[PDB]
Symmetry: C3
Subunit: 233 residues, 3 copies
Amino acid sequence: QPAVRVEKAGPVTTVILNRPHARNAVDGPTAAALLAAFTEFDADPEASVAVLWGDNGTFCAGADLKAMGTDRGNELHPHGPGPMGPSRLRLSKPVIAAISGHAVAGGIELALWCDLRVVEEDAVLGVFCRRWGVPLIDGGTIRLPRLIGHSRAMDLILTGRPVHANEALDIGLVNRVVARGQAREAAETLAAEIAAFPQQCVRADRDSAIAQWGMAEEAALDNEFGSIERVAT
Amino acid sequence: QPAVRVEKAGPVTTVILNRPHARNAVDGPTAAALLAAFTEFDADPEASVAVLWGDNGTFCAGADLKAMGTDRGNELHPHGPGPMGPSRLRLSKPVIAAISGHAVAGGIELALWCDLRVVEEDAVLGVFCRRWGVPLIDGGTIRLPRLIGHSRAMDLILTGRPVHANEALDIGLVNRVVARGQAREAAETLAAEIAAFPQQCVRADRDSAIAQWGMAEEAALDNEFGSIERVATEALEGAGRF
Amino acid sequence: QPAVRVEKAGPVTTVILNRPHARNAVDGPTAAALLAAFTEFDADPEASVAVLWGDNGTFCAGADLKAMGTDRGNELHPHGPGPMGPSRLRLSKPVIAAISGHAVAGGIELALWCDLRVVEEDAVLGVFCRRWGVPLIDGGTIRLPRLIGHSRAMDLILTGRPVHANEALDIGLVNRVVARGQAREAAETLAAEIAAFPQQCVRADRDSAIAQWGMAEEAALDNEFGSIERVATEALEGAG
Ligand SMILES: [Cl-]
Ligand SMILES: [Cl-]
């Protein structure tokens, strides 16, 4: 019955969202638990790669709209943590989204906060909060243009339209498409593969790819150079 | 036969370029009129989404090469407005390009300045000014890479080659492809769809998506959080529905 | 037998990497020769576009792993030049990658440093250094996300996987795919096409497309406006 649970298999930690009646929507306490799970993952020396997976046939419907306006609603912190929980956490290690069913609104934002996205053939991603007038305040306006280009990003943001798996893959919004029911396993396999590689190197390259955004090239290249030292140590 | 005219249909404002002899090329006075049309749109509280449409079977051929070297030539302002007119204006509300025929040179730049692009199946986009030796000075060198990625932007910019609708859609250069004759209508329908959503929320998300470019992620996320206060009145007005 | 040579045909300069026993891997001395070749190109007023081509059926396998840990290894300079040689050089004129065989590790970074990439249909690109535990330190972490978007870049970087030509084209990692053995010719043809346009204007647009990254839009636009002055002489030359 816990909204969030964590299962580990060697160096891959799977963080699991489970709110069957709420289509894995995330309220205040669920957000805090998601944040706690990723903070533990980040600090855990034995954990190399995480997987974020929604249980029971869907990924995440976004913020819990029933709970908004109540004591259980998402917390609104100007400098973070983000309303969905970990959406402003800059992890030292990668996370793979394992998406079944719907990843919409705050749920697409959690997907986008992950480093890679594995989706099932019938899954749907979208900015559905467009319909409701609830703004993207879990990084969607920053990550969508950077992940897939401003043009496509503006399409998804302005229209709020659904994006199915084949289009999602074609435009780079997701990285793998697998059969129905297979997302968790495919993501965990991918995570295990990334975890088998030399880890300080994975982390130096990842951290640089993320940090370079918004930097002038010379400055970005000076930072990238620091990876040598990271992997010597 | 005014070069620029404006037609409104509820909350959608259509800005129409019409210079049949010049294939909708934009000289100085036309640029000023385009700028004024969009300035008016920006200030009109009843107007939610604009459509930029070229009349008589084409979008825009670029800056008017025939007006070059005359007092009808495009104006060159170091800090704006841009030569094509509205190309350095940051509108508070979105614009959709409705592209028939050609969107080339300064004309592809107008298309890129819009938020979304709907093109007809036989239309052609391109940095044709490459052949002419006329530089991109209406944001093309900035918006092409950010819109479709640096690699494809370099292809289009270096070669100046034509891009047909098929390829344009595949690479994200355009967002919708429709049948010949249908761009204005399809763009207007898409515009009405966007205008039917809660608008302060639309504008908050759009403004952040535009502004985050070049910012460090933390500062960008701090700015994005501002959207809560932007929609506060509108969320309350809609509290019943919600 | 020289590791690097240079051949010119009119305004197109082809820089050729040839280390057939080492799969065109780049050690310290080869890197220095690649840098010198591109430095010469950059200063050559008659050279308009460069082509980077690997001889003998492959492009470049990255840093020479056998030279690594010796005094022939790549040099490590905090502020440049880059270990592969020219990878931190911001050239005043464009370069086209002509890829056969493999462009991996440092080799994919040289490909990404070029402006355009023409690849052979059986060619393979990849971040193979992921397996080796050697970091991307020739701009791959910067150029990959900017070139094809953050999502696809993270795929390639984290997994280190091989990307074939068809996928490469589809995702914008390469710009043209041609038949086996034809990358050099196809790149030289494309280079000559680009060389035939007015060049000050090409260079103004290119420099602005590069410089704008990281800049706020407004500052980027102010910089872009400078292209008018850059082309002033050329515009008059072409006036009538
Ligand atoms: Cl895009
Ligand atoms: Cl991408």
